[PDB]
Design a protein around this ligand. Structure first.
Ligand code: L7U
Ligand code: L7U
Ligand code: MG
Ligand code: MG
Ligand code: MG
Ligand code: MG
Ligand code: MG
Ligand code: MG
Lengths: 236, 9, 236, 9
């Protein structure tokens, strides 16, 4: 790896600089290098890893959606034939997206998840595994679509089981996990009723625990709760 | 249009 | 070049798709491939080349400015020592920026400018040469800062001489050239009075020629004229 | 702050 000669602390410092500069491909490369040092990641370091790759894959997902929409229109019953270029370029972006997802999943499997014993780290990483299988699912069409969906579901479910046992219902990682699993149900798994039920139960259980929180924790939890509510409004 | 997922920290 | 096996027309088609997807690094690579086919570029193709590289270098310039500001603060008389990382990463982004500028200048020199005989194409390319030397000047600090500035000045001046002879004062390329040369004077050449004089004369001469224009041409010309006015307001 | 240059077409 091209980051193998850089100090771990220097990689983390440069990841933070790259974030400030909105250089998220660099940020991801720095954080990949930090993970490959082999030590576990702190809470802040896990956040840097997540921010970096979410921004990278986020741009890819947006681009893929634009190209897939153009391609679907080119294949409308009445559209002029335009050659292989739209499909080729959608495939190029898709392959790059799948590569980013495979990179993240590879870091989680070698060896972030297996060394993660605390609930905060293990739930974070299993949620991330679910998320990057979900992004693979968004573009999957072959045999393995079913298996990709089941991999996402399995990761999210393991994360849910741990979070319900080990975290209060207002814990922001627990809330964000439930939010993303509800998106999985609605957008990937053709299960809108499950999505709605999970979002509603998550929201209500958090509401009842807000009284235990400081002002700063209350702000964090209610921000994610509002996203659950936003989706429930979109979905109903 | 699309559902909202967890934003960046 | 990795685009050497792709049809010219396919490269242009994919550049337009990349623009729609906001994938400007891809767009630039496609347009570089199109230029390297060796044929002259049409007006639309020149625009695609410019849009692609302006967006790429624009992100680099923004990132460089953030990192240079952090570095300047680290070197303030009283700042804690933080090691070589800020300088290293600013240098990394700077080198990538210089590489993009060198790539564009290379395409202009091999062989876009020498084959450009019409005023619209020749002024466009010489303006572009001035612009990418100006971006090099923004980060230059060594011996060659003076020579980079003179290269920008020379390209802009040749472009100005042709535009004044061959284009009406409302021509949008002529206007954008004058705008960018005025920015060169103010921001690079320590010549704010020249910047103000050029912006004012350009604005006034265009004003007096607007009566010759159609509604659509009037919209194009007045948009750039407003930018001259915006700068004159900032500068005075 | 900084001067405005020609925008994208
Ligand atoms: S490590 C520093 C202190 N703790 C944290 O930052 C937590 C890290 C893990 N975490 C999350 O990932 C959750 C899902 C999250 C993500 C994004 C958020 C954004 C906002 O507002 C912009 C609010 C809350 C969250 C929560 C929880 C925080
Ligand atoms: S090739 C299609 C018809 N002609 C054009 O598009 C011209 C190409 C060259 N050109 C310019 O580069 C000038 C400097 C320009 C650039 C950007 C602009 C943006 C706007 O509004 C967004 C308006 C005008 C211009 C002009 C002139 C146009
Ligand atoms: Mg070490
Ligand atoms: Mg594919
Ligand atoms: Mg249930
Ligand atoms: Mg051919
Ligand atoms: Mg340097
Ligand atoms: Mg003069």
């Amino acid at each position: 790896g091209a980051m193998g000669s850089m100090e771990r602390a220097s990689l983390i410092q440069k990841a933070k600089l790259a974030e400030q500069a909105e250089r998220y491909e660099d940020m991801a490369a720095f954080m990949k290098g930090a993970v490959e040092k082999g030590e576990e990641l702190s809470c802040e370091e896990r956040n840097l890893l997540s921010v970096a790759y979410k921004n990278v894959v986020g741009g890819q997902r947006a681009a893929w959606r634009v190209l897939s929409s153009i391609e679907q229109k080119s294949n409308e019953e009445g559209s002029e034939e335009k050659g292989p270029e739209v499909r080729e370029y959608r495939e190029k972006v898709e392959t790059e997206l799948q590569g980013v997802c495979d990179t993240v999943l590879g870091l989680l499997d070698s060896h972030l998840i297996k060394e993660a014993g605390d609930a905060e780290s293990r739930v974070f990483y299993l949620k991330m595994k679910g998320d990057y299988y979900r992004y693979l699912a968004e573009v999957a069409t072959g045999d393995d679509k079913k298996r990709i969906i089941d991999s996402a579901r399995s990761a999210y479910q393991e994360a849910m089981d741990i979070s319900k046992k080990e975290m209060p219902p207002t814990n922001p990682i627990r809330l964000g996990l439930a939010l993303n699993f509800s998106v999985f149900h609605y957008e990937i798994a053709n299960s809108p009723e499950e999505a709605i039920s999970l979002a509603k139960t998550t929201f209500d259980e958090a509401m009842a625990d807000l009284h235990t929180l400081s002002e700063d924790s209350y702000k964090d939890s209610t921000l994610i709760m509002q996203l659950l509510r936003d989706n429930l409004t979109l979905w109903t | 249009q699309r559902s909202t997922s967890t934003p960046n920290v």
